Amino acid sequence: MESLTLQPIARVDGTINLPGSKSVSNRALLLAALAHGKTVLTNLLDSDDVRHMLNALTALGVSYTLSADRTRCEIIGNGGPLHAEGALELFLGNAGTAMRPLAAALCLGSNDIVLTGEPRMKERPIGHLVDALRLGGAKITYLEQENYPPLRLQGGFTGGNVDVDGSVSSQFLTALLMTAPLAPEDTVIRIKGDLVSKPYIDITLNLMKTFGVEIENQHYQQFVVKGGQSYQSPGTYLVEGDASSASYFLAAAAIKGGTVKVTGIGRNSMQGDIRFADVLEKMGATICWGDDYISCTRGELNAIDMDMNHIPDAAMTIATAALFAKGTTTLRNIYNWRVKETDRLFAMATELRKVGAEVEEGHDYIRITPPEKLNFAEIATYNDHRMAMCFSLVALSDTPVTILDPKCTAKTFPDYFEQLARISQAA
Numbered sequence: 001m002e003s004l005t006l007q008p009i010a011r012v013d014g015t016i017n018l019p020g021s022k023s024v025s026n027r028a029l030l031l032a033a034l035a036h037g038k039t040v041l042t043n044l045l046d047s048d049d050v051r052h053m054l055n056a057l058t059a060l061g062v063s064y065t066l067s068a069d070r071t072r073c074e075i076i077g078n079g080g081p082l083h084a085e086g087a088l089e090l091f092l093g094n095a096g097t098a099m100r101p102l103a104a105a106l107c108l109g110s111n112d113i114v115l116t117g118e119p120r121m122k123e124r125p126i127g128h129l130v131d132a133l134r135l136g137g138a139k140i141t142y143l144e145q146e147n148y149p150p151l152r153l154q155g156g157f158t159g160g161n162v163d164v165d166g167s168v169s170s171q172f173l174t175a176l177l178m179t180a181p182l183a184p185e186d187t188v189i190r191i192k193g194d195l196v197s198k199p200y201i202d203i204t205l206n207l208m209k210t211f212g213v214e215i216e217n218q219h220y221q222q223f224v225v226k227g228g229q230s231y232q233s234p235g236t237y238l239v240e241g242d243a244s245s246a247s248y249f250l251a252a253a254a255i256k257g258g259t260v261k262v263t264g265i266g267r268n269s270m271q272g273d274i275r276f277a278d279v280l281e282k283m284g285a286t287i288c289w290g291d292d293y294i295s296c297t298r299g300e301l302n303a304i305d306m307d308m309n310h311i312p313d314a315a316m317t318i319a320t321a322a323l324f325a326k327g328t329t330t331l332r333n334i335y336n337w338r339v340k341e342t343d344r345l346f347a348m349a350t351e352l353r354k355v356g357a358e359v360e361e362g363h364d365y366i367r368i369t370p371p372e373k374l375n376f377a378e379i380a381t382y383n384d385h386r387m388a389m390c391f392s393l394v395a396l397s398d399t400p401v402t403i404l405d406p407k408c409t410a411k412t413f414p415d416y417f418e419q420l421a422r423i424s425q426a427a
């Protein structure tokens with residue numbers, strides 16, 4: 001199959017202008033499609049997950065244009081809930097930010113639509129979301145395995161008292177929050193117990209406010225939403241650079257810099273993954289913050305033992321950076337790594353051992369003890385963009401590394417290797 005071999009990188013130094021945020025891009029596209037008026041999004045991400053959302057909007061009848069590089073999008077808002085009948089099938093690849101939000105949104109009014117995706121998406125849970133939507137009136141059918149896509153949506157979500165489990169994915173709550181304002185009746189969303197990935201809820205609420213809707217957030221345990229609302233175009237909107245994509249470059253400087261500056265995110269960014277920079281600082285790197293950049297300069301790199309529930313995606317980057325740190329690194333409270341692009345606890349542990357690390361794969365944590373020296377490995381990537389990007393950091397050592405299916409990075413970052421190469425220096 002396809003593979004890419006990375007030769008040892010002696011030093012990293014430079015500036016990277018970040019690709020747009022996947023989380024912000026897919027929320028902005030769905031809200032722009034539901035809104036009244038024309039929205040012009042700039043710095044939109046061009047990646048597989050965004051392309052699946054754009055294709056779904058096209059299939060649903062939404063009109064929009066894209067610039068040549070697909071980072072500028074002018075969307076003609078539908079002025080209300082989207083509609084299609086005839087069991088129209090929307091293929092959503094493995095994009096949670098399209099699958100979860102559309103599963104909720106398309107329950108408004110009457111519809112007859114099927115949502116499906118790649119084989120792995122049919123193994124990613126959606127039951128907590130379906131349960132909540134049904135409590136609000138939605139008619140939803142599991143076409144294959146109970147609690148997983150594919151789903152046949154027949155509409156009916158009117159609002160009301162809705163409980164939702166927040167212990168497995170914050171995306172279910174995000175989907176409900178974006179949908180409820182357009183339901184005819186008021187909705188009170190009650191979180192059953194724990195809520196994981198809380199920072200992503202703040203991104204959702206930030207986007208909803210940009211599009212003209214606010215709700216009452218009672219300590220992230222209950223959300224009061226008034227029905228009969230409408231989203232309104234914000235005119236022009238600048239999508240933040242992606243803070244998760246930024247993690248690889250900031251970590252590379254922490255290991256082998258040099259100073260690497262990423263632009264497009266800064267201290268005021270809404271993305272919780274900017275907190276990844278705080279972890280590098282705790283490990284010994286030097287961080288500089290700007291309005292529109294974050295930079296990292298090599299310092300020391302010491303192991304850490306931290307709860308990473310607030311940054312599940314960027315936390316994977318600490319798992320390979322740990323190969324270069326002094327001591328044993330432990331990342332805790334990351335159970336849902338198991339239900340994402342792949343089971344990331346199994347995948348990360350398996351591949352880390354291949355380059356020499358001693359790894360304890362905990363049920364919901366990972367403990368990593370680096371080897372005295374890394375060895376060569378051909379890294380399996382599990383159709384997971386982050387496995388490829390995280391293991392690219394192995395090349396910041398004296399050994400090359402071969403990454404299988406490097407194009408899997410296109411889920412969120414098609415140009416990843418060219419960008420890592422931009423900051424890679426031989427001297």
Ligand SMILES: O=C(O)C1=C[C@@H](OP(=O)(O)O)[C@@H](O)[C@H](O)C1
Pocket residue numbers: 022023024096097168169170171174196197200312313336
């Ligand atoms: O809402 C979002 O944009 C995302 C939320 C997170 O999912 P969980 O809430 O399932 O952790 C994250 O891992 C995913 O890549 C993007």
